[PDB]
């Protein structure tokens, strides 16, 4: 049994960050040197480990989180960061142990005229806790009069589309992100 990393990285469609995907990786042998030693990933940052020595380590079991965000937001997917993505979408703990991988996906997730399928959470009154997933679509009450389910003044939809176009500057282009969180059932070769 070899770990199903192709199903995570090479998946046809990715999740939106507010509804990020989480896959458990259990009782398989994992090759991380395939991942680190390539030209593919513009971000490949490891915390608590070295990318060099990823194969010769064992974990209780591993989680592969994945989603799509714009490029200049990929820096929010690190321990200690703040911002709309880190505060209201996907939050890493301060003591995170694992690796954060991200590559440009303009050729997969961009559409002419705008891909409005990917969304992020814009409004929220408290920050998410580490590894929280919030998928509520309640109207956001920014004033005192209750909203009663209809957008208007001081009543906003909490989610916003990215609208990825192939002609955007690459800072605004979609990036696919995989976060690897690290008995014992998941080992290297």
């Amino acid at each position, epitope marked *: 049994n070899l770990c199903p990393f192709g199903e995570v990285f090479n998946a046809t469609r990715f999740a939106s960050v507010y509804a990020w995907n989480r896959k458990r990786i259990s009782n398989c042998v994992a090759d991380y040197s395939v991942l*680190y030693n*390539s030209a*593919s990933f513009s*971000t*490949f940052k490891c915390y608590g480990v070295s990318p060099t020595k990823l194969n010769d380590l064992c974990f209780t079991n591993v989680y592969a989180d994945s989603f799509v965000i714009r490029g*200049d937001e990929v820096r929010q997917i690190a321990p200690g960061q703040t911002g709309k993505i880190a505060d209201y979408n996907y939050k890493l703990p301060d003591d995170f142990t694992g690796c954060v991988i991200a590559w440009n996906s303009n050729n997969l997730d961009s559409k002419v005229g705008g891909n409005y399928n990917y969304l992020y959470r814009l409004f929220r009154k408290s920050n998410l806790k580490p590894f929280e997933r919030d998928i509520s679509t309640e109207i956001y009450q920014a004033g005192s009069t209750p909203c009663n389910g209809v957008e208007g003044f001081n009543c906003y939809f909490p989610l916003q589309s990215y609208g990825f176009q192939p002609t955007n500057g*690459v800072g605004y282009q979609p990036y696919r992100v995989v976060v690897l969180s690290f008995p014992a059932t998941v080992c290297g070769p």
Partner: nanobody
Amino acid sequence: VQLVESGGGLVQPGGSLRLSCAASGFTLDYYAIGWFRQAPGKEREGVSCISSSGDSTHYVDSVKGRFTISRDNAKNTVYLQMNSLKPEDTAVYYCAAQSGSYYWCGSDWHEYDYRGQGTQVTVSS
């Protein structure tokens, strides 16, 4: 954490410069470093990148034979040797550092996280 460029300035057509990007606040081992140029009134373009592996990729045709990018992990700096300089080469040169996979190099400025504030290279004629 800062990236300071140096070694540029005024130079004659045919002369050479040696650009130095000195990085502080972090070590450059896992990072790929790229050199970019911004000509008068345009947006930045990638000139050449070296990866964490130490491998090079040059993105401008004009510059393949002439420029050579080098890395020094012990002194924490990266070098761009520019030979056979031309008036076309006049620009503000920036360097940038990005922590990617081993062989990753990027032509695109907005895909590096750490950026320098730039140094001017002016060639006469």
